[PDB]
Design a protein around this ligand. Structure first.
Ligand SMILES: CC(=O)N[C@H]1[C@H]([C@H](O)[C@H](O)CO)OC(C(=O)O)=C[C@@H]1O
Ligand SMILES: OC[C@H]1O[C@@H](O)[C@H](O)[C@@H](O)[C@H]1O
Ligand code: NA
Length: 601
C-alpha cells in the first residue's frame, strides 16, 4: 500500500522539567493507547543519577501525546534515589502493565556491590512498577531478592525497551524481561527474568554468555525464544542465542555478522505477534538498531521472514545520530519506534510498505580476480514470500569504473531461484577487497545482500608466517599469524611482557605458499592503539626463504587506519618480508593488524 514514515519528538533536552532525557520504552495498552516511557535525568547521567521514570500516552494512535507524567520519581535530596532504564511489559491475558527499571541509591550498574536488601544503598536494585489501570497509576516494588539466585550477581539491570509474553507452548502466558548481570568474575551475562503467574512472582532463569549486555527476547514461530544482545566486548555486531525451554536457559552465544552494531541497545519484535504457531507470518521479525559499527548512527529497520536466520530487507530510518531504539507492533498494523536522535526522545511510526521489502534472502559468493579480468558468479535466491515474481531484476552497486550486470530467474513460491552476476574489473584497478552491494528488485519489494570482490590480492589462506623477529603470546594474542587471518581486530604485536624484548627494527616474513608475480604489500596498522605503529619500513622478497632481495621498496607509513600500499616492480617471489625500522614516535613495539600482498593468484 502507501508508504508511511512520520516522526515527532516526545521529549527535548532542556524542556518540560529535565536538562536531559534518555532511554526509550514503548508499548501499547490493552485499550490501544501508546505508552512511551523514558528517563528524565536532572544531571545528564545514568544511575546513580537521581533519575525519574517518565511516561507520555497517546489515545489517538500516536498522532498526539498527553502530558509527561512521573511513573517513578527520583529524589535529589537525602536520601538520594534514582529510577532509570525503563522496560514495558504488557500481560495481554490480564491487562496488567509493568515498567521495569533500576532503583539506585549510592551505586550505578558498574559500582553495585553484592546483596539484595532494599535498604542497602550500594546495591543497584531491580524495581518494577505495576499498573492495573492502563498506566494511569502505578505501585512499586523491588524484586532484586527474587531474581538473584546466585549471591555472586553483584549487579543487574532490565534491558530497556519492551519485554514479552509467550503465546505458545507449555509456558504460554509467561512474562519475560531480559536483564544483564555482573557476576563474581566481573563478567557481564544475560538472563531472562520471568513470571508464570501474571506478574505476582518473578524469578531469574539461567545466565548466559560473557561479553553480554542489554539484550532482547522474541518468541519465534515454534516457541523457541531468541535472545539478541549488545556485545560489551565490542565485536561490532549483535550476539545471539536461543532457548527451547521458554527462556529459562539458552544455548551457545554467537556473534551474528548480519547485524552490525556499535555496542548499543536495539530491539527485536514479531511483526505479526497474533499469528498462529508454525505460520509464515509468525516467522517474521523486525529489528531496530544503529547499523554503524563505529558510531550510534544509521538507524536501520531490518526484517527476517525465517525466525531471524536471514535479514533480506533493511531500510535506514535515521541516517544521523541514533542511539537506543525500541519497536512495538500497533493495533492498526503499523509500527511504533521510539528512539534517541541525540536531542532526547522521538517517536516514529512506519508501515511494511515504507520498509519496501520482499522475503527473498539471496546469496552471492565472494570472488577473486585480477585487474583486467571478467568473472561470473551464481546468485541463489530463497523465495520465502509465498508469491510469484515473473520479472525480477538484480541491481549492483560497485565502483563505476567496473562494468557490473546481473540477472535472476522468475520467483516461484517456495522455490529457490538462480541468477548470475558478471563483474568486469578494468586493468589498473587498485588492488583491494571491494564490497559490492546487490539489490533484488521486484514489484512486490526489494531485498539485498553484499559480497566482496578481491582484486589483485593474493590468497591469505595459502600464506603462512616464514619468520618474525618477535611476538607476544603470553599476556595477549599478538601472534605474527594474526596479520594473515583477514580479521582487522586481531594483530601481530612484538613481545612486550619481558623487559628484554627487542626494540626496532622488527621483521615479519610471509610464505606465499607458492611462487607468484607480486608487485606490492599493503599494511594495516593496529586499529585500537596508537603507539606500536610502523613508520619507516623496507620490503624484501625471496624465492627460497633465506636469500632476501632488496630493499625492493622502502618508505615511511602514516598513521592512517586504512590499508597503506608499498609497491615495487613486478617480480616472482615465494616470500615477502616487511622490516619495520621505526615506530611512529619511537616506541619500542610493532603491531600490525593485516598484511596483504599485491600479486597474481
Ligand atoms: C543501568 C544503566 O547503567 N544503563 C545504561 C547502560 C549501561 O551502563 C551499559 O549498557 C552497561 O554496559 O549504558 C547506556 C548507554 O547509552 O550505553 C545507557 C543506560 O542508561
Ligand atoms: O606496554 C605494552 C602494552 O600497552 C598496553 O597499553 C596495550 O594494551 C598492549 O597491547 C601493549 O602494547
Ligand atoms: Na588480523
Amino acid at each position: 500500500g502507501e508508504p508511511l514514515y512520520t516522526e515527532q519528538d516526545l521529549a527535548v533536552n532542556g524542556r518540560e522539567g529535565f536538562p536531559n532525557y534518555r532511554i526509550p520504552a514503548l508499548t501499547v495498552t490493552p485499550d490501544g493507547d501508546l505508552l512511551a516511557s523514558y528517563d528524565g535525568r536532572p544531571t545528564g547521567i545514568g544511575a546513580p543519577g537521581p533519575n525519574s521514570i517518565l511516561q507520555r500516552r497517546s489515545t489517538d494512535g500516536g498522532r498526539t501525546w498527553g502530558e509527561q507524567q512521573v511513573v517513578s520519581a527520583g529524589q535529589t535530596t537525602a536520601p538520594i534515589k534514582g529510577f532509570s532504564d525503563p522496560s514495558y511489559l504488557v500481560d495481554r491475558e490480564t491487562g496488567t502493565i509493568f515498567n521495569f527499571h533500576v532503583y539506585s541509591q549510592r551505586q550505578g550498574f558498574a559500582g553495585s556491590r553484592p546483596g539484595t536488601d532494599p535498604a542497602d544503598p550500594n546495591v543497584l536494585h531491580a524495581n518494577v512498577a505495576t499498573s492495573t489501570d492502563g498506566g494511569l497509576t502505578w505501585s512499586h516494588r523491588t524484586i532484586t531478592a527474587d531474581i538473584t539466585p546466585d549471591p555472586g550477581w553483584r549487579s543487574r539491570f532490565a534491558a530497556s525497551g519492551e519485554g514479552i509474553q509467550l503465546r505458545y507452548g507449555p509456558h504460554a502466558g509467561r512474562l519475560i524481561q531480559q536483564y544483564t548481570i555482573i557476576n563474581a568474575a566481573g563478567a557481564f551475562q544475560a538472563v531472562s527474568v520471568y513470571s508464570d503467574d501474571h506478574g505476582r512472582t518473578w524469578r531469574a532463569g539461567e545466565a548466559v554468555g560473557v561479553g553480554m549486555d542489554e539484550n532482547k527476547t522474541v518468541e519465534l514461530s515454534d516457541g523457541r525464544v531468541l535472545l539478541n544482545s549488545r556485545d560489551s566486548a565490542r565485536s561490532g555486531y549483535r550476539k545471539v542465542a536461543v532457548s527451547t525451554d521458554g527462556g529459562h536457559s539458552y544455548g551457545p552465544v554467537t556473534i551474528d555478522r548480519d547485524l552490525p552494531d556499535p555496542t548499543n541497545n536495539a530491539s527485536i519484535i514479531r511483526a505479526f505477534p497474533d499469528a498462529p504457531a508454525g505460520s509464515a507470518r509468525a516467522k517474521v521479525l523486525l529489528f531496530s538498531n544503529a547499523a554503524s559499527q563505529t558510531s550510534r548512527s544509521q538507524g536501520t529497520i531490518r526484517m527476517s521472514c525465517d525466525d531471524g536466520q536471514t535479514w533480506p530487507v533493511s531500510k535506514v530510518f535515521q541516517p544521523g545520530s541514533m542511539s537506543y531504539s525500541t519497536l512495538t507492533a500497533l493495533p492498526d498494523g503499523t509500527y511504533g519506534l521510539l528512539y534517541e536522535p541525540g536531542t532526547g526522545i522521538r517517536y516514529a511510526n512506519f508501515n511494511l510498505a515504507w520498509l519496501g521489502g520482499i522475503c527473498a534472502p539471496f546469496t552471492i559468493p565472494d570472488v577473486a580476480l585480477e585487474p583486467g579480468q571478467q568473472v561470473t558468479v551464481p546468485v541463489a535466491v530463497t523465495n520465502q514470500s509465498g508469491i510469484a515474481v515473473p520479472k525480477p531484476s538484480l541491481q549492483l552497486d560497485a565502483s563505476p569504473d567496473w562494468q557490473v550486470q546481473g540477472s535472476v530467474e522468475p520467483l516461484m513460491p517456495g522455490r529457490q531461484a538462480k541468477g548470475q552476476v558478471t563483474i568486469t574489473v578494468p586493468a589498473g584497478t587498485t588492488p583491494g577487497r571491494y564490497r559490492v552491494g546487490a539489490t533484488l528488485r521486484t514489484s512486490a519489494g526489494n531485498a539485498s545482500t553484499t559480497f566482496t570482490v578481491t582484486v589483485g590480492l593474493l590468497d591469505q589462506a595459502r600464506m603462512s608466517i616464514a619468520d618474525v623477529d618477535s611476538e607476544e603470546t603470553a599476556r595477549e594474542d599478538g601472534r605474527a599469524s594474526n596479520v594473515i587471518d583477514g580479521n582487522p581486530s586481531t594483530f601481530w604485536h612484538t613481545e612486550w611482557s619481558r623487559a628484554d624484548a627487542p626494540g626496532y627494527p622488527h621483521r615479519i616474513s610471509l610464505d606465499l605458499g607458492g611462487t607468484h608475480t607480486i608487485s606490492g604489500l599493503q599494511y594495516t596498522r593496529r586499529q585500537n592503539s596508537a603507539n606500536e605503529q610502523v613508520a619507516d619500513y623496507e620490503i624484501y622478497t625471496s624465492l627460497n626463504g633465506t636469500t632476501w632481495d632488496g630493499p625492493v621498496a622502502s618508505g615511511r607509513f602514516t598513521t592512517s587506519l586504512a590499508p597503506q600500499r608499498a609497491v615495487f616492480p613486478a617480480r616472482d617471489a615465494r616470500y615477502i618480508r616487511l622490516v619495520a625500522l621505526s615506530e611512529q614516535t619511537g616506541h619500542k613495539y610493532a603491531a600490525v593488524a593485516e598484511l596483504e600482498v599485491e600479486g597474481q593468484r
